């Protein structure tokens, strides 16, 4: 009949929506967050605990996620490429992004500071200065051996 | 006599492989044989109703119950270790990456794997199938073909619905009953799912189950003996096999991707 | 077929129309007229509405006969046409003859029920253990003197087909 | 009962012996004699070995007739000879032999009017909740009751409608 | 019409209650009614081999598969949290308090819940049951009574065998395949099982659903309609209902003991 | 037949053996496990994390389990009753009983430090002195507020 | 009227099934052997950050009861925690204090009670007078880093 | 159609027996009927986290298992007996064995340091000097109450 | 001659299914181009407490390879870890050092590499020269409390 077609279509849509829910919402995938975001590069000295799909934030609030990490063949540092939502586009260039630890034992995201009032961005450009991600080893080395 | 028992056992052993090959030829002639005149998409819709839409209340209620079981249980075991926020991640990971598709294959082998062999084996006992070839419509393409198609494209959808309702029910018992912090459930959940190894993993594991469940459920019926007891033995053989084809194949699919 | 062999997922109308919609692409209004006249010829015209399980066992076979006579075949086979009857069996045995003399179509009634078969049959056969055990007109087959065929055409419980089963002597059966 | 209604988990011997092991505690060698002489009476004496699905359709009914006549009942009713001639002949001969020999009441309940009247001596007709007359097969052959003359003969049309309640062969066909 | 659909819905509603009470009266008359002459322990043995012993290969193979799955899975989830030598207790917690008995109820509702409804339901269609009351043996006590006792005393045993084979198979894939330290498996396992909340918990959870699994599997057959399709619909209703009464009843039983 | 009465009984035995394996080789209640053990009392000032079915030990290796915790109605202290293995019956009376936290985040187990005395015990007697379980609040109160 | 009796028994079983859910049926922190013989008490705290419902209250480590509810008194802007006390323990004087502790290091923040000294004990339904509230990490590290070091 | 039927029957019977035997050999640890790991002893003062079947090691790499621990009824210390991989046969007698901790919160393993340099071992002998396991209570008592 | 064909097709699919799906064995991860090719190196440490196999080696945080094996050299009683290095990253100087670091605070102890100062790089199959070993809680607290504070 037509009620059979209506039901089959309704629940075929229900299953596909549940699939898209497991993908977008349960997993936290790209499509919903992808939208229109513009890339930015960043040079760090150590990226020990930042992973793909790791949040990038400013003043605590997320602006996007990091997209990929690279070991440059030239300077032996870490080049992280990260997306940034289009609405947030007033980040200055002299801004200093660093690697912060969520809570105390959470994943290491990247939080950026306020970069004065010079030229804003190209949204596809690179950041200049940073504060690298900390490591326990050098931390306790500088803490115990040298200071105390 | 022992020489009689061993001959009967070897006959059953070779008969099993004969049936395993006849099933493959049957699936071939059903899925890509020809295009008989009586076919269409209306058959596939009618089947998708009886196979998936009718099997919707069973797997939805079961997914809700298994979710509010998984959460109500893991909360109890994880409180001992000290990890509590992550019950939303642990409950979702077990259901989405494994138990979800497995229990959906167990309930879809039971409801739409028995109501499929019984429906297509009664079609054989009452000569409903034989009266099709004599009309001129290949019953493998008019009867078996939509039933196989309904199973392939409904059991993964039912497994996705199962996982969604199970996750949501686990939330509704963790948050509203067990009082774990609301937002942490979905947060801790989505940061550690890794779609390509949990969502797509379980979805491929569910597709693989659907092809092996809706084919041993549509063949068991087509190759039953035409009697009220042959059908009732086939509708049990198709639950046994399609439970062994769910569990075992899930072991072979999870070795491929942990 | 006996027990009708009616497509359960289809209603009586679409059931009778099924042979049409297969070999023919006719207008859905013209197809209804062909289905309606057929269902009338068997008397099951009023139940163009029901599902084959909402039909009694006797009428489930008449609608199947109507499905058969759709497309107007030139021969048509009846397996166990008159198994479980008496008034229902009468209408069916009248229809299988009316369809023959009226439509001029070959009818092959294939049932072990000998009385009514011979009643409507004109050239009746007997098949046994892999081979045709003679054939003929119902009377010439009534007294063919073939022990197997005279044992079949009449009751005669004992004959070529054994009444007793292959066992040991009854005298010593319970004695030993 | 029609189709045998044979206990599948029991073999033919224990099948026929079942009514004995219930009301009676007889020696297992005495039960064997009755089961053996009861199975021979129906002609199914050699198949004291098989399972009820290893038996053909018509032969399965004969073993059931033997299970029934075990314990020697004084009346016995065989609901539904049907869907089977040589077999039907042995069955219709046995239901009469068991009657005249054992002097037991037989209640044959089958639609097959011909053979029923053949062995029946006082045949009834039951319709739509009420007994629609009764009598000896000939006195019932021409009782002039429209329903009963319609049943006792073929006569496709009569009190029981040949046509279903349609609307109109002129309207429904044109409208 | 809507007034017709709602009347049909309410009729189906009240009828579902009528059947749920008729099933209780049936279970009463079956379990503690009388002592008919044809009864004995031979019936219980003959039914114990058809309800349990025949259902032994299915649940054993399935327990092996589900154990090598639970271990092969939790190891992958435990390899990230350092609790590596804690995979043994996992295949003995996620297989001994909630999933062991639940999957055993799902496979016992499928094999011996569908093979017990199509065997006790095909006896009603062929008048095998009606020919018992006219002999004088109450079929509720001669046919239904043994099947009820061979379900009660076999599904817990099958669940114990299921848990044992699952634990051992999880060992055989953790130790011999995944290379976790052998002795730690059983050691970490047995120090944190807490018998009174794992073993006896799962065993009571298996007795509970297992009893329900063979009550709504032996009733649906006894109250089917006597036809080759009524039996085939009852052997599906008894898989659906005995999967719901496994899952939901496991929720009700785990909400009492986490 | 007897081909079934043996098959049926065989697996009625197999299932009961599986039950016994679950009760014995999967949980380890009593087959040669913890057996003849004698009770000892202990008065503590705080047993915050001391749960039932714990571990009372000596020099790291376990001595037995703790059986029951109680709040005595007179002094409002924590009286624990714990089982001590029979083979270990040489603990002096003066020995101390502290509550040590297993590892760094494990369960609070009772640990006995040998004091050293000729008299041992009655295995049904009580212990004299102790050191109560530590609580983080008082710990940091003495650390931050009081000490520095 | 057989259907009537069948529906009656079905409803009788459905009733038990409804009561078979046992969604928080009995309410306590232990079995009914001890029973529900417990009477309330209140406590005024300044910060109860981790004293979520269905916790534990104790003395000298051994639990005394479970917290029943937490409230925000709109007048003095403090926290009022109402909890239950087992009846066998009926000797906690008034001058005794309550204080939020933590089970180990990352456990649920229970509330312990330190007994002081006074003849009168309670009325088991009264309110405590003094306490030491639950410290958060932030005030702790502020007091630690900026002030002392 | 009769000679090869019994042939496939015997093939399947042998395959089933093969499965049964290849499953059985998991229990009764599958290194034949015995292994090649020689023992060694060690006396500690506290083995709080050295429960049975731990890892022994040198320089971080695992050497063997801890077989058993026992409260020697004379000294009230802990005797740990542990298997050593036979290739590892060159640790001198004066080597020390201290209870370390896996990372930061892992189960305590025991690690052997070379110590001195003399006669190697008997591989079944006893170790002499060691540093016992740490306990958080004594640690904080020394840190807070004693030092700070 | 149908049944024979049916048995043949059953054997065909059955034989194919076991090889294609089971045997749970060696990796064939596109061994037709570039293999994700990696060449090993050795590294001498002094304590390798948490560098268990299936770990990671890295430089500046981003992964460079995985640890293949750990070994105790019977002569020096020290640890030799052999690991893999991605082919694209092939400019690691000699005096570049390795050191066991910890992911976050409770993560798996991986092996980071700090760049050195000489020109010549590697043969990707050599060993490293100098390192900083892994830390342990016991030695850490022993150097903290007993010597500096006390
Ligand atoms: C990718 C292609 C897909 C093809 C198949 C993929 C994998 C599927 C694997 C099939 C699993 C088989 C289990 C069947 C169990 C069963 O039916 O078990 C149930 C049957 C039921 O018997 P009946 O057929 O009488 O009902 O039990 C038996 O017949 C008794 C034992 C028979 C077992 C035979 C095993 C055959 C396996 C093939 C090896 C033989 C080699 C032949 C060389 C000459
Ligand atoms: C210095 C400060 C001292 C405090 C530091 C200790 C804090 C860490 C606590 C340790 C807890 C721990 O070991 O474990 C803590 C970890 C890490 O935290 P997460 O909960 O966020 O993962 O949690 C888990 O283990 C998560 C459980 C997930 C389970 C998923 C389901 C498993 C199988 C699924 C398929 C089947
Ligand atoms: C990602 C890769 C894609 C995966 C593709 C799916 C593969 C398809 C497999 C086909 C399965 C066979 C279907 C047969 C059709 C049928 O009706 O088959 C019916 C016949 C039975 O014939 P009868 O009618 O005579 O009983 O065969 C069966 O009984 C089949 C039982 C299937 C059991 C599946 C078990 C597989 C798991 C094996 C694990 C072993 C591991 C051991 C390690 C210790
Ligand atoms: C005052 C009296 C009110 C009546 C109460 C009766 C309620 C019980 C029956 C539910 C309605 C069933 C309608 C059938 C649907 C249909 O179309 O009918 C479909 C099927 C049967 O018909 P089919 O022949 O089509 O299979 O019905 C069912 O699926 C039966 C449902 C069984 C559920 C009853 C037991 C549930 C117990 C849990 C109760 C606790 C609730 C918890 C939440 C808080
Ligand atoms: C390496 C091969 C892969 C191993 C598994 C392959 C999957 C298919 C085989 C599973 C068994 C199929 C039985 C189906 C159930 C059935 O017929 O249903 C139960 C039937 C009942 O027979 P009916 O047809 O008469 O009702 O019981 C039987 O007669 C089946 C006999 C088969 C026995 C073999 C299996 C026993 C143990 C399984 C292997 C042990 C694992 C450990 C090894 C490491
Ligand atoms: C299906 C899987 C469902 C649950 C599987 C495991 C659940 C949690 C996984 C471990 C998280 C880490 C916790 C930790 O710190 O570690 C917890 C301990 C580790 O303790 P040790 O390292 O001290 O031995 O191990 C466990 O994970 C506990 C046993 C796991 C059994 C799961 C309980 C049943 C779940 C049923 C659901 C199905
Ligand atoms: C917040 C949400 C939480 C809600 C949770 C709801 C849980 C409900 C439980 C699910 C059970 C569904 C039963 C399905 C049966 C059905 O549909 O029932 C319907 C069928 C008949 O329906 P038909 O009309 O279709 O034939 O009933 C039967 O055939 C008989 C089954 C009766 C068995 C009922 C189960 C009761 C169990 C009581 C024992 C408990 C012991 C515990 C002691 C410790």
TrEMBL record, chains B, E:
Alphabetized InterPro entries for the sequence: ABC_MlaE_roteobac (IPR003453), MlaE_Permease (IPR053408), Permease_MalE (IPR030802)
Membrane topology designation: Multi-pass membrane protein
Taxonomic superkingdom: Bacteria
Transmembrane segments: 8-28, 48-72, 157-179, 199-218, 239-258
Primary location group: membrane
Listed GO MF terms: phospholipid transporter activity
Any GO BP: phospholipid transport
UniProt cross-references to PANTHER family, sorted A to Z: ABC TRANSPORTER PERMEASE PROTEIN-RELATED, PROTEIN TRIGALACTOSYLDIACYLGLYCEROL 1, CHLOROPLASTIC
Recorded family membership: Belongs to the MlaE permease family.
Protein name: Intermembrane phospholipid transport system permease protein MlaE
Organism for this UniProt entry: Pseudomonas aeruginosa (strain ATCC 15692 / DSM 22644 / CIP 104116 / JCM 14847 / LMG 12228 / 1C / PRS 101 / PAO1)
TrEMBL record, chain D:
Keywords: ATP-binding, Metal-binding, Nucleotide-binding, Transport
Domain spans labelled ABC transporter: 1-153
Transmembrane segments: none
UniProt GO molecular function: ATP binding; ATP hydrolysis activity
GO BP term, pick one: lipid transport
Family statement drawn from the similarity comment of this UniProt entry: Belongs to the ABC transporter superfamily. MlaF family.
Function field: Part of the ABC transporter complex MlaFEDB, which is involved in a phospholipid transport pathway that maintains lipid asymmetry in the outer membrane by retrograde trafficking of phospholipids from the outer membrane to the inner membrane. Responsible for energy coupling to the transport system.
Subunit: The complex is composed of two ATP-binding proteins (MlaF), two transmembrane proteins (MlaE), two cytoplasmic solute-binding proteins (MlaB) and six periplasmic solute-binding proteins (MlaD).
Annotated protein name in UniProt: Intermembrane phospholipid transport system ATP-binding protein MlaF
Native source species: Pseudomonas aeruginosa (strain ATCC 15692 / DSM 22644 / CIP 104116 / JCM 14847 / LMG 12228 / 1C / PRS 101 / PAO1)
Automatic annotation (TrEMBL), chain G:
InterPro entries xrefs: ABC_MlaD, Mce/MlaD, MlaD_Phospholipid_Transporter
GO molecular function: phospholipid transfer activity
Domain of life according to the entry: Bacteria
Pfam families assigned: MlaD
Residue ranges occupied by any Mce/MlaD domain in the UniProt entry: 38-115
Coiled coil: none
Residues that span the membrane, as ranges: none
Example of a GO biological process term: intermembrane phospholipid transfer
A GO cellular-component term linked to this record: plasma membrane
Matching PANTHER family: INTERMEMBRANE PHOSPHOLIPID TRANSPORT SYSTEM BINDING PROTEIN MLAD, INTERMEMBRANE PHOSPHOLIPID TRANSPORT SYSTEM BINDING PROTEIN MLAD-RELATED
Protein's name in the database: Mce/MlaD domain-containing protein
Species annotation: Pseudomonas aeruginosa (strain ATCC 15692 / DSM 22644 / CIP 104116 / JCM 14847 / LMG 12228 / 1C / PRS 101 / PAO1)
TrEMBL record, chain I:
Domain of life according to the entry: Bacteria
GO terms classed as biological process: intermembrane phospholipid transfer
Domain Mce/MlaD span(s) in chain numbering: 38-115
Transmembrane spans: none
GO CC annotations on file: plasma membrane
GO MF terms held by the record: phospholipid transfer activity
Protein known as: Mce/MlaD domain-containing protein
High-level lineage: Bacteria, Pseudomonadati, Pseudomonadota, Gammaproteobacteria, Pseudomonadales
């Amino acid at each position: 009949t037509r009620t059979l077609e209506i039901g089959v279509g309704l629940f075929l849509l229900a299953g596909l929506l549940a699939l898209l829910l497991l993908a977008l919402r349960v997993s936290g995938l790209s499509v919903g967050n992808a939208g229109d975001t513009y890339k930015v590069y960043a040079y760090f000295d150590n990226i020990a605990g930042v992973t793909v799909r790791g949040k990038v934030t400013l003043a605590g609030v997320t602006i996007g996620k990091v997209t990929a990490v690279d070991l440059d063949r030239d300077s032996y540092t870490g080049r992280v490429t990260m997306e940034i939502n289009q609405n947030v586009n007033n980040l200055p260039v002299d801004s200093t992004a660093s690697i912060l630890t969520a809570g105390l034992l959470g994943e290491k995201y990247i939080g950026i500071s306020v970069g004065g009032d010079e030229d804003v961005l190209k949204d596809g450009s690179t950041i200049h200065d940073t504060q690298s991600a900390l490591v326990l080893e050098d931390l306790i080395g500088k803490f115990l051996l040298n200071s105390v | 006599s022992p020489l009689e028992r061993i001959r009967l056992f070897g006959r059953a052993g070779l008969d099993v492989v004969a049936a395993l090959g006849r099933s493959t030829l049957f699936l071939g002639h059903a899925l890509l044989g020809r295009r008989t005149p009586g076919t269409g998409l209306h058959l596939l819709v009618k089947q998708l109703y009886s196979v998936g839409v009718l099997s919707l209340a069973i797997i939805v209620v079961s997914g809700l119950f298994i979710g509010m079981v998984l959460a109500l249980q893991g909360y109890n075991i994880l409180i001992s270790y000290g990890s509590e926020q992550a019950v939303g991640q642990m409950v979702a990971l077990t259901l989405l990456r494994e138990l979800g598709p497995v229990v959906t294959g167990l309930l879809f082998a039971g409801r739409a794997g028995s109501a499929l062999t019984a429906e297509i084996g009664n079609m054989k006992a009452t000569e409903q199938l034989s009266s099709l070839e004599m009309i001129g419509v290949d019953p493998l393409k008019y009867i078996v073909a939509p039933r196989l198609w309904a199973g392939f494209i409904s059991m993964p959808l039912l497994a996705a619905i199962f996982s969604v309702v199970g996750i949501w029910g686990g939330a509704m018992v963790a948050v509203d009953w067990l009082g774990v912090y609301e937002g942490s459930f979905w947060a801790n959940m989505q940061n550690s799912v890794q779609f390509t190894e949990d969502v797509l993993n379980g979805v491929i594991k569910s597709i693989v189950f659907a092809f092996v469940v809706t084919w041993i459920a549509v063949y068991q019926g087509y190759d039953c003996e035409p009697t009220s007891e042959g059908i009732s033995r086939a509708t049990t053989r198709t639950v046994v096999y399609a439970s062994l084809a769910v569990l075992g194949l899930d072991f072979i699919l999870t070795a491929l991707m942990f | 077929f006996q027990s009708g062999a009616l497509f359960t997922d289809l209603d009586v109308f679409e059931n009778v129309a099924f042979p049409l919609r297969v070999h023919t692409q006719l207008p859905e209004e013209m197809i209804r007229d062909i289905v309606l006249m057929k269902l009338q010829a068997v008397g099951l015209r009023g139940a163009v509405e029901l599902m084959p399980d909402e039909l009694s066992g006797g009428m489930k076979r008449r609608v199947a006969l109507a499905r058969a006579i759709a497309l107007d075949p030139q021969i048509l086979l009846y397996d166990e046409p008159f198994v479980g009857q008496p008034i229902a069996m009468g209408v069916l045995v009248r229809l299988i003859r009316l369809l023959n003399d009226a439509l001029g179509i070959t009818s092959i009634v294939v049932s072990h029920d000998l009385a009514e078969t011979a009643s409507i049959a004109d050239y009746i056969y007997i098949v046994g253990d892999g081979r045709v055990l003679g054939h003929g007109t119902p009377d010439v087959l009534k007294e063919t003197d073939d022990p197997r065929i005279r044992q079949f055409v009449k009751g005669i419980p004992d004959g070529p087909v054994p009444f007793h089963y292959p066992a040991r002597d009854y005298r010593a059966d319970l004695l030993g």
